[PDB]
């Protein structure tokens, strides 16, 4: 997360590390029940075998509210591109259901209609993740959070170099130094309602990493709705 | 009735439905008495910043 802030304490419970044999964050997550994990889908790639980590904040001491579960089944979209990042988008079956307390919370869903006009039309929308600071420094050690701003759909298309199609949105500093960066992919990018906040969107791609005239570009959700209904009873 | 007044006095999901206006809620929660508010059920709910 280049900028931004830090999580405190229960601030990001939604947030989820998908972690590799050598036990390293490799991606993010987020929480939806006690037995799903939702993802960025071209996260599975980069580790032959994988676990999901919930509650921790500090990837080098101990919190004692961490947890490691396994997967039992990943549910990618049929769909996906890699070549081109679209459909980008993926669920994970736990094996052993998600223990909720301090520091792990599922987020809300929210309603497609009301969602794209009220929660979509909101000024700001919160990432989050473990990964890297800087385009070409190393990966976080502390759960970041940063408020990446809507983005205009069509300043988007514009600042683009790549094809920002129907499944997915643009969001954070035209010029500012705050993006996501590499090992947040996956991510949780919820957006808040009083007091309340719900997945709108999966830290998908962008061109380096909170560059001049480049955006965020983020998964978005509120399309795959119905998907991800029938993907938490696995499809 | 317009859900684009202030979400339609909503704490959630809102629907312009025909006239008046319907209150909804996340899955884990239930519609207060007066119709508009979500009260949790469970002791995590989606959503909140755990405490
Ligand atoms: O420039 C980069 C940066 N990383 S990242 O730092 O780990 C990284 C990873 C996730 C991120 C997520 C956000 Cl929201 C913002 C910045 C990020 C940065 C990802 C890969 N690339 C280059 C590729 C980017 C996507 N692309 C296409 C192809 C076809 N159609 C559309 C897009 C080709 C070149
Ligand atoms: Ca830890």
């Known amino acids: 997360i280049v900028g931004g802030q830090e999580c405190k304490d229960g601030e990001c419970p939604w947030q989820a590390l998908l972690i590799n044999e050598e036990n390293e964050g490799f991606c993010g997550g987020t ?17 032959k075998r994988f676990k999901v980590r919930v509650g921790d904040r500090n990837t080098e001491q101990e919190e004692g509210g961490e947890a490691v579960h396994e997967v039992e089944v990943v549910i ?25 307390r301090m520091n792990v919370a599922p987020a809300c869903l929210p309603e497609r209609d009301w969602a794209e006009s009220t929660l979509m039309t909101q000024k700001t929308g919160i990432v989050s993740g473990f990964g890297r600071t800087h385009e070409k420094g190393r990966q ?3 759960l970041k959070m940063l408020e990446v701003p809507y983005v205009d759909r069509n300043s988007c298309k514009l600042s683009s170099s790549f094809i920002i199609t129907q499944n997915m949105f643009c969001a954070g500093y035209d010029t500012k130094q705050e ?12 957006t808040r309602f009083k007091d309340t906040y719900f997945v709108t969107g999966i830290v998908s791609w962008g061109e ?19 998907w991800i209904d029938r993907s938490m009873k696995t499809r | 009735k317009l859900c684009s007044l202030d979400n339609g006095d909503c704490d959630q999901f809102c629907h312009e439905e025909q ?7 996340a899955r884990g929660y239930t519609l207060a008495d007066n119709g508009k508010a979500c009260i949790p059920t469970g002791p995590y709910p989606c959503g909140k910043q755990t405490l």
């Open chain 1, 140 to 142: 976080s050690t502390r």
């Open chain 1, 76 to 100: 990618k979209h049929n769909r996906f591109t890699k070549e081109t990042y679209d459909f980008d988008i993926a669920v994970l079956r736990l094996k052993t259901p998600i223990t909720f």
């Open chain 1, 208 to 226: 380096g990493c909170a560059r001049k005239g480049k955006y965020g570009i983020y998964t978005k959700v509120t399309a795959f709705l119905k």
């Open chain 1, 179 to 190: 993006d996501a960066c590499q090992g947040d992919s996956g991510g949780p990018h919820v």
């Open chain 1, 31 to 47: 929480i939806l029940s006690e037995f799903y994990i939702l993802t960025a889908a071209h996260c599975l790639y980069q580790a």
């Open chain 2, 19 to 25: 006239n008046s206006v319907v209150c909804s809620c």
